[PDB]
Chains A and B, each alone.
Chain A
Amino acid sequence: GAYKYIQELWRKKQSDVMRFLLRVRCWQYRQLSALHRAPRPTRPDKARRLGYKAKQGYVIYRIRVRRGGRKRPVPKGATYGKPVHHGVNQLKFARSLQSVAEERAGRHCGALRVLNSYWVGEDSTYKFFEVILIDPFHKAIRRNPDTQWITKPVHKHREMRGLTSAGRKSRGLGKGHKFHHTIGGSRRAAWRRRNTLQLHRYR
């Protein structure tokens, strides 16, 4: 199949073939608005993996996120605290720019529900991500029993809660020795158990 050839060609991003396409498209993407609808997946291959079945109701928005970290919003760099919290410039936002992309695609398209996203280019100033959006109300999705999980009210705004694959990676969850601080539901759920007096009735 062609998809395996597109898969391994997309791993040779330093090649003359892909450095032409990742640059000339990255030009084309700057000239477009910061959030616009793409008519198809830029990568038909990558969208296959992340769940994009090319049928009616499946949507792909190409949104760009302004590149760099996060500087602390304080007037004239003055945090009026202790020398630890004096920091502003070299600070980093907890979620990835791919997750910041999905939650603008999903916020703008509130009617739709965000599945996943994939990188399609980066410049000095911007990254570019195709975000896979689904209609929970198109009968193609609303009838297909293996894709009617998004159609239920539990999956409203996955992108906003870190349920999307890009969103999950900011939380620090997974199994084993490295992911103890989010054992239970999350980092918030771990913290609670550990800082709750189980004052038993008898004790």
Chain B
Amino acid sequence: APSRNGMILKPHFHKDWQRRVATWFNQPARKIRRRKARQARARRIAPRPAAGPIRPIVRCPTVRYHTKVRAGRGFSLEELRVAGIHKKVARTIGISVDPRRRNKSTESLQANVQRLKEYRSKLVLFPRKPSAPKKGDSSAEELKLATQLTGPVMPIRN
């Protein structure tokens, strides 16, 4: 019953809610669980970027957010084609692809072309056999300065 000037408030506790209470004593153990896995993965993907493959410059949809820029799902097939990267070879050298992404602008297209141009120059490519540097590889003195990129690779700034 209402006493005086109160707020006409409606709690959602008319169901058997006590059975389905999700407690967060997992949280500090979970943050260690995720962190131990993140370290063990980073040491596995041994000289590669820790955060994973490069994500493209992507505008946020809806009029609220289109003043901002994100990391996308992966690079469009015409962003790779104008850059001159094969969509099956892109994934192997650490480039995110999604075939779903159209390109409506030349601005976002040529920005993500110039993104892949900056990436491939930054890229250090090991031979598939150590005792056989093949034609599409890098030099020994440029292979010894290879360190895991802590943080997201080429961080996308607004």
Interface residues of A (CB under 8 A from B): 192, 195-201
Residue pair B24, A201 in contact (C-beta under 8 Å): yes
CB distance from A31 to the nearest CB of B (A): 52
Cβ-defined partner of B24 (8 Å) among A192, A195, A198? A198
* Residues on A with beta carbons closer than 8 Å to the beta carbon of B20: 192, 195-197
Query: In the complex, A195→B27 CA distance in Å?
Result: 20
Query: In the complex, A197→B22 CA distance in Å?
Result: 6
Residue pair A199, B17 in contact (C-beta under 8 Å): no
Residue pair B17, A197 in contact (C-beta under 8 Å): yes
User: Interface digits, B24-59 against A, CB 8 Å rule (1 contact, 0 not)?
Assistant: 110100000000000000000000000000000000
Residue pair A198, B22 in contact (C-beta under 8 Å): yes
Query: In the complex, A133→B49 CA distance in Å?
Result: 46
Query: In the complex, A61→B25 CA distance in Å?
Result: 52
Query: In the complex, A195→B21 CA distance in Å?
Result: 9
* Residues on B with beta carbons closer than 8 Å to the beta carbon of A198: 22, 24
Cβ-defined partner of A201 (8 Å) among B17, B21, B27? B27
Is B66's beta carbon under 8 Å from chain A? no
Interface pairs (18), CB distance under 8 Å: A195-B15, A195-B17, A195-B20, A196-B21, A196-B22, A197-B17, A197-B20, A197-B21, A197-B22, A198-B22, A199-B21, A199-B23, A199-B24, A200-B24, A200-B27, A201-B24, A201-B25, A201-B27
The B1-20 residues at the A interface (CB cut-off 8 A) are 15, 17, 20
Query: In the complex, A198→B23 CA distance in Å?
Result: 6
Q: Please name the residue on chain A nearest to B23 by beta carbon.
A: A199
Query: In the complex, A40→B17 CA distance in Å?
Result: 54
The 6 closest A-B pairs by CB, nearest first: A201-B24, A196-B20, A196-B22, A200-B24, A198-B22, A197-B21
* Residues on B with beta carbons closer than 8 Å to the beta carbon of A200: 24, 27
